[model samples]
Target: DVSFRLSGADPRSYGMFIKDLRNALPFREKVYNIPLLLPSVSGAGRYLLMHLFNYDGKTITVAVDVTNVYIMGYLADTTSYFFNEPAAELASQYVFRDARRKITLPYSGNYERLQIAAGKPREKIPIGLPALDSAISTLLHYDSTAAAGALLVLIQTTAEAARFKYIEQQIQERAYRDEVPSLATISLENSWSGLSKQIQLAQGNNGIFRTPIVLVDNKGNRVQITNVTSKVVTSNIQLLLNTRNI
Candidate 1:
C-alpha cells in the first residue's frame, strides 16, 4: 500500500508516465523523476515532491499516469546507439556475441512526447468507422438474400476493450467471435494524446492502421478523427511505434 498518488521514474526504456513538457513549470521546463524502486528493490526516502527538468535532447520521454492510467518500463545498459538504420537490420543481429534491446522506445496516451522512433507517420487510416458504416448500409439494402456479407477490417482494442473486445462483431447466430481481424487501430487524436479511436474490419487478411500524436501537433492535423479509450497502453504501441515514426 502507498499513500502517494504516484511514484516517478527515469529509466527511458521503461515507458513510464512523464508530464507534458510544455505545461508551465518551475523553470522553463523541469521534469520530476521520483525513482521509487520496486518493492522488490526496496528503499525509503523523504516525503517531498521535487520538480526537475532541463533534460533536453537527452530527455528520454514523458507521460501523465491518470491521463490514461498507464505505464511501461524497460531494461537497458549503456551499450547501444542512436541513429537511423534499415528498420530492423541491426535488430536482426545476435551476431559477434552481442544482442541488445535497441527496439525499446517510449510511449503514453499523450501525443507530444511519443512517436514511432523510425517509422513514417501515416495519415489517419481511412477504415474502421467509415467501413463499418458502409457495410451497415449495404447489409441494410440486402438484408433478405445475403447469405454471408461482411466488410473486411481490423478492430480497435484496449486493456478493458481488448480483454473485453471493444469493436466486437458477429459469427453466424451464436458464436462468441466475429470474422474480422483481432488487432487494434491506434491512430493519433487531435488532442495530441495518441488515443485510439475506431478500427477496421476484415475476415482474415484484412488490414492495418499514433502518438501523443503527429497531427494534433504541427504535422498530421485533421478534423475527421473520432478518438476514445482507457487509461492503459499496450505492447502494440511499442511494436508499432518502433516501425512507424510516431
Candidate 2:
C-alpha cells in the first residue's frame, strides 16, 4: 500500500544517482542508501531506496524506507528529498552499533526536517556516526560481492526480534567466522514489504501470515528453519555454507 513516485527520475536513474552519491561521500562521512530491485507484475525493475540522515545534528536522525504494494504506478516528474519508526526499529538488523539509541522524529516531521536540512549549505549539514557509517559500507560491500556462496540472509518479523537477536549473537560468538559468509538480516515488519515478492514467498506456509527464520543464499536457494534454537540455526547455516552445487 505504501509507495513513492520517484520524482524527477525513474528507478534506474534514481538508483544510479544514489550510487554516485554514496561513492562520492568523503571519508568518515557517509551517505547511507540501499537501492533494492523489487518484484513487479509488469516485468520492469521496481526499486525502493532506503536512506538515513542525521537531520537533527547529533541528537536525532531521520531514516526512510517504504513498502511497495507491487503494482504499476505513475511517477511524478518533479523533484524529491525523505523511514517511519518501524523501518528504523527494523534497522537494528542492518546497523552494527547502537541502532537502538537513535532517537527518531515522528513520521510526519521526518521528511519535513530532512527536506529542509538537505537543502542547507554543504558544511552546515552534520556528519553521520563514523562507526555506523563504516558498518553500513561494509554491509553494502558484502551485499555486492558475497554472492558466491558467501552470504546468509536472515528474514524475520518484529515479533521474532528477540529470537533474531539470539541467532545473531550465536553467529558472532562462534569460532567459524572465517569459514562462513557474513550474515545480513532483514526485519519483515517493513523492510521486506517492498522487496521482491519472490523473497516473501520463500517464507513458505509457516511465514505466510506469521514469520519464520529463513536462510537465503545468492543462488536463490532458501531454507526455512522451523526451529529457531541456537544449535539448529548454526547447523542449518553451516549446511547452507557447505553445499557447493551450482
Candidate 3:
C-alpha cells in the first residue's frame, strides 16, 4: 500500500479534494496490466493524503497536472523504494551521455559544433539561390518529355536541394569556419565539378533517357557523391554549371 499528501496555501481547494477522492475510491483492482491516473488541481493549498496498496508483480504509475507539485513523506518514500539509488544514478548518467553524444562530429573528423563556428566559407555566392533554382528548372524542362528519365532528373534536383540545404545549415549554424572559402571557388574546384562532368557524359551517352543518381550522406556523416547514373548526370550538369557561371 502507498499513500501520500497534497500541500499548499488552501487545503480546501486542493487537500480536501484529494483526500475525499482517495477515500471515495479506496481500493483499485487491476483488471489490466497497465493503469494510468491523471489528476489536476486549480488553486493553492496544502494537506497530506495517505495511500495504501499491494502490488502483485504489477507496476503502478501516477500522473498529475498543475503548475507545480511537491512530493514528500510517504510519496517520496515510495518513489525512492521503486527507483532505488543505482538505477537513479544510471538514469542520470545516461542522460549526460545522450547529451554528450549529440555534440559529436557530424561528418568524418568534423565536429558539428566546431564546424558550425569554424568552417564557414569566407565568400558565399551572392546569387547562389537564384542560380541553383534556375539550374534545376532547366534540368526539369529538359527532361519533361521522358517520364522515367524526368523523374530521375527530379530526384537529382531534390538531391541538389538537399545538398544546398546542408551547406546552408552549416553556414547558418556556423558549424565550420576555417576561413570562408569562395562558394564559386569551391563549386569549381570541389568534387561537385567532377560530378557535373560525369552527368554531362552520361546525358550525352543516354541521349534522351537517363537514370536518377542517388545521393547519400556517407558513413563519415559527410555528404558525398553516390550511386550516380548517366541520365542523372546529364540532367544535373546544366544546372551545376550554371551555378559555376560557366
| TM-scores for all predictions | 0.18, 0.20, 0.20
What are the RMSD figures for all models against the true structure? 20.6, 19.6, 28.5
User: 239, model 1: CA deviation in Å?
Assistant: 24
User: What is the lDDT, from 0 to 100, of the residue 111 in candidate 2?
Assistant: 22
Highest lDDT: which candidate? 3
Candidate 2, RMSD to the unseen true structure: 19.6
Number of clashing pairs per prediction, in order: 29, 2, 38
Compared with the true structure, what per-residue lDDT tens digits does model 3 show for residues 1-246?
A: 223221221223223333343333211221111111112222221222223222221221221111111111112122311122232233333222322222111111111222233333223222122222232333222222222222222222222322233333322222112223234223422344355434444445543224333333312233433333332232222223211221
Candidate 3, residue 50: CA error in Å?
71
Candidate 3 lDDT trough over 10 residues, lowest sum: 64-73
Cα displacement (angstroms), candidate 3, residue 106, comes to 35
Model 2, span 162-213: residue lDDT tens: 1233323322332122122223332222223322232233335432323445
Candidate 3 global lDDT: 0.26
Residue 177, candidate 3: C-alpha displacement in angstroms: 10
What does candidate 2 score on TM? 0.20
